[PDB]
Design an enzyme around this catalytic site. Structure first.
Site, PDB file in Angstrom:
ATOM      1  N   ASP A  54      17.346  34.328  60.675  1.00 24.24           N
ATOM      2  CA  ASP A  54      18.148  35.349  61.351  1.00 24.24           C
ATOM      3  C   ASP A  54      17.532  35.826  62.685  1.00 24.24           C
ATOM      4  OD1 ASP A  54      20.409  37.207  61.332  1.00 24.24           O
ATOM      5  OD2 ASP A  54      18.764  38.670  61.382  1.00 24.24           O
ATOM      6  N   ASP A  57      12.250  37.078  61.622  1.00 27.57           N
ATOM      7  CA  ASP A  57      11.943  36.978  60.201  1.00 27.57           C
ATOM      8  C   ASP A  57      12.419  35.602  59.709  1.00 27.57           C
ATOM      9  OD1 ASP A  57      14.652  37.340  60.425  1.00 27.57           O
ATOM     10  OD2 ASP A  57      14.818  38.670  58.637  1.00 27.57           O
ATOM     11  N   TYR A 206      22.124  43.810  56.500  1.00 33.22           N
ATOM     12  CA  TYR A 206      23.418  43.428  57.108  1.00 33.22           C
ATOM     13  C   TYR A 206      24.548  43.935  56.226  1.00 33.22           C
ATOM     14  CZ  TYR A 206      21.178  40.789  60.780  1.00 33.22           C
ATOM     15  OH  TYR A 206      20.446  40.498  61.904  1.00 33.22           O
ATOM     16  N   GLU A 423      13.203  43.259  69.516  1.00 30.75           N
ATOM     17  CA  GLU A 423      13.860  42.444  68.502  1.00 30.75           C
ATOM     18  C   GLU A 423      14.588  41.285  69.155  1.00 30.75           C
ATOM     19  OE1 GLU A 423      13.921  41.399  65.684  1.00 30.75           O
ATOM     20  OE2 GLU A 423      15.798  41.654  64.560  1.00 30.75           O
TER      21      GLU A 423
END
Ligand SMILES: OC[C@H]1O[C@@H](O[C@H]2[C@H](O)[C@@H](O)[C@H](O[C@H]3[C@H](O)[C@@H](O)[C@H](O)O[C@@H]3CO)O[C@@H]2CO)[C@H](O)[C@@H](O)[C@@H]1O
Ligand SMILES: [Ca+2]
Ligand SMILES: [Ca+2]
Ligand SMILES: [Cl-]
Ligand code: NA
Length: 614
Positions: A54, A57, A206, A423
């Site tokens: 994703d 990670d 999510y 991120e």
């Protein structure tokens, strides 16, 4: 910075290549990525290898992965000629195929869809490269008894859109994609529910905030585009009556992994010219660009002082990019005054994240002026120590990744721990990649991609012993060694690492002794065998001890995981006085402080991977 949108597009696709899980092709462009997640699906009896990680990670989250593939395919559908003329079409198809190949594996049975591999807590508790993940990686599914209309609809849209763009070069693969898309959509439509009520782990990362009504519309309209069968347009239009009163359709968010309303209504607006969809599209894009007029007042998203349309704290650039993409698509569809306003909005938002901002920097890793150096990404960082601050700089360049970006006042920190700023994620780059294709179409005349790119990275020292002298005498030498696996090019698990420690027995032979008379013994020992002396060069009296951690897993994944220790002594018979370490190859430069040495060579499964032999 002299922008090259072909190079930018090339890099954005390279980010998706960096996200690959599974067994990697031999002609992989990234020498710092290796095979990983090879046991994915084994707990449930299935091959679930492949797909994309994703973000920074290693969880494969099905809902944002489906969304990302769908938006990537959507831009190839809209801007195929831009992909072609920038030289990126083969790469764009190859990269989408990585995800759709995984969806085919995950769609084992017509009404069953594996929607996650990896558990969020287990995965995120550990900070290390993908190839050496030490933890369990459970697989989770939806099915008819515990369904997921959002996950199943979104995946059907990914397969349906991909089926369109694959048809010219691979019609049998296109047919396969389309057949699974039809089955997944029937699953979504017949067995209703939010996928995160059934893969409950996903609620923490999510969550299905918006529910599944939007994915139901999105799947059906993509099936219509992919078949031209009227039944799918009717299903799409029927599914819209569950959106309720068109006057209250949401317009203050944007297209996102969780809410595809904004994509579905835009596609329906072009297919139908139905004023319900046109107005809803224009409320959204007015709100994002010049402001939405109630005739009473103007309602408008927050803008940073530097000009970024700012939705919220997390993945701010992803949101503005997602909105820019809807704006580009709308602006190529219709010829209204709003098309020009939205086109200008989309360009300016794209120019902001490419460097036209108060930090005076690109927000795409490895592109432009002063790009982010510390994206929040385990494998690119390359820690051997399960620590975000070790090493202090990334070992690899995560080319093409769009970072979360600035806060509402344009503030930003290039810090591996700053998740808001740094991120990275597959959904971050999905609409962005299409925006780059459009920038190439508009401004990229004569832009060519980079040839032979990226160059293979030169590894640092990956496997090595640090050693020190415990004690030395006129009949023995005692060594402390820590055998290290700090690999990164690619990181690799090693359970057959060994080293060799070489000595010159010339002074022994001159005293009437021989290799037979030297005893090699281990003391403190974390699992090695230490051999007796073996000859290296019999004519010159050069011998070694082979010290082997056979069956001991060593890997770049933590302070204890990455090294194993053994202390060992080479002893001549008690009372002899000939022993002389000073002419011993592996004694050279050793001190009483543990220090890397090139004269203790290191072997993996018998293969020399570091150091010098005599
Ligand atoms: O329920 C109607 C309201 O919807 C609001 O939009 C929401 C989106 O539907 C939803 O998908 C989004 O989910 C975000 C989530 O809030 C965030 O934490 C996560 O990181 O990303 C998700 C996907 O982007 O939330 C928004 C906001 O609640 C409309 O904004 C609102 O006007 C309307 O009443
Ligand atoms: Ca949804
Ligand atoms: Ca000697
Ligand atoms: Cl450890
Ligand atoms: Na750096």
């Amino acid at each position: 910075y002299p922008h090259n949108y072909a190079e930018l597009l090339q890099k954005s696709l390279l980010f998706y290549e960096a996200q690959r899980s599974g067994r990697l092709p031999e002609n992989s462009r990234l020498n710092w990525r290796g095979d990983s997640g090879l046991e994915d699906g084994k707990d449930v009896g299935l091959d679930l290898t492949g797909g994309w990680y994703d973000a920074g990670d290693h969880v494969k989250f099905g809902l944002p992965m489906a969304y990302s593939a769908a938006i990537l395919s959507w831009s190839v559908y809209e801007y195929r000629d831009a992909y072609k003329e920038s030289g990126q079409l083969d790469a764009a198809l190859d990269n989408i195929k990585w995800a759709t190949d995984y969806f085919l594996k995950a769609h084992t049975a017509p009404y069953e869809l594996w929607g996650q591999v990896g558990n969020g807590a287990l995965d995120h508790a550990w900070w290390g490269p993908a190839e050496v993940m030490p933890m369990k990686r459970p697989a989770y599914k939806i099915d008819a008894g515990c369904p997921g209309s959002d996950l199943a609809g979104g995946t059907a849209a990914a397969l349906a859109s991909a089926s369109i763009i694959f048809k010219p070069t691979d019609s049998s693969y296109s047919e396969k994609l389309l057949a699974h898309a039809k089955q997944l959509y029937d699953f979504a439509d017949r067995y209703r529910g939010k996928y995160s009520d059934c893969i409950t782990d996903a609620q923490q990362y999510y969550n299905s905030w918006s529910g599944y009504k939007d994915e139901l519309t999105w799947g059906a309209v993509w099936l219509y585009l992919a078949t031209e069968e009227q039944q799918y347009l009717d299903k799409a239009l029927a599914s819209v009556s569950d959106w309720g009163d068109p006057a209250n359709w949401p317009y203050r968010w944007t297209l996102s992994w969780d809410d595809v309303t904004y994509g579905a209504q835009l596609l329906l607006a072009r297919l139908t010219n139905d004023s319900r969809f046109v107005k809803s599209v224009e409320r959204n894009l007015d709100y994002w660009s010049t402001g939405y007029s109630h005739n009473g007042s103007i309602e408008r998203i927050t803008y940073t002082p530097g000009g970024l349309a700012w939705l919220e704290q997390w993945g701010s650039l992803r949101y503005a990019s997602n909105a820019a993409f809807l704006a580009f698509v709308y602006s190529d569809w219709v010829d209204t005054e709003k098309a020009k306003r939205y086109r200008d909005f989309a360009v300016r938002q794209t120019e902001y994240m490419l460097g036209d901002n108060p930090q005076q920097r690109s927000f795409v890793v490895g592109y432009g002026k002063n790009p982010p150096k510390h994206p929040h990404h385990r494998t690119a960082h390359g820690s051997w120590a399960n620590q975000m601050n070790v090493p202090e700089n990334h070992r690899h360049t995560l080319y093409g990744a769009l970072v979360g970006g600035p806060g509402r006042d344009d503030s930003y920190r290039d810090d591996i721990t700053d998740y808001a700023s740094n991120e990275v994620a597959i959904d971050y780059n999905a609409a962005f990649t299409g925006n780059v294709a459009k920038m190439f179409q508009l401004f990229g005349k004569g832009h060519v991609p980079l040839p032979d790119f990226p160059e293979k990275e030169t590894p640092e020292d990956e496997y090595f012993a640090e050693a020190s002298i415990n004690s030395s005498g006129n009949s023995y030498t005692e060594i402390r060694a820590q055998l290290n696996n700090r690999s990164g090019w690619p990181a690799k698990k090693t359970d057959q690492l060994s080293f060799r420690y070489y000595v010159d027995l010339t002074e022994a032979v001159e005293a009437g002794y021989s290799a037979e008379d030297i005893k090699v013994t281990a003391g403190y020992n974390e699992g090695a065998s230490v051999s007796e002396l073996k000859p290296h060069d019999a004519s010159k009296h050069i011998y070694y001890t082979e010290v082997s951690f056979s069956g001991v897993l060593i890997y770049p994944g933590g302070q204890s995981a990455h090294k194993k220790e053994v202390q060992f002594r080479l002893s001549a018979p008690d009372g002899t006085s000939f022993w002389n370490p000073e002419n011993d190859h592996s004694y050279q430069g050793l001190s009483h402080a543990l220090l890397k040495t090139r004269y203790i060579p290191v072997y993996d499964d018998g293969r020399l991977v570091f150091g010098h032999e005599p």
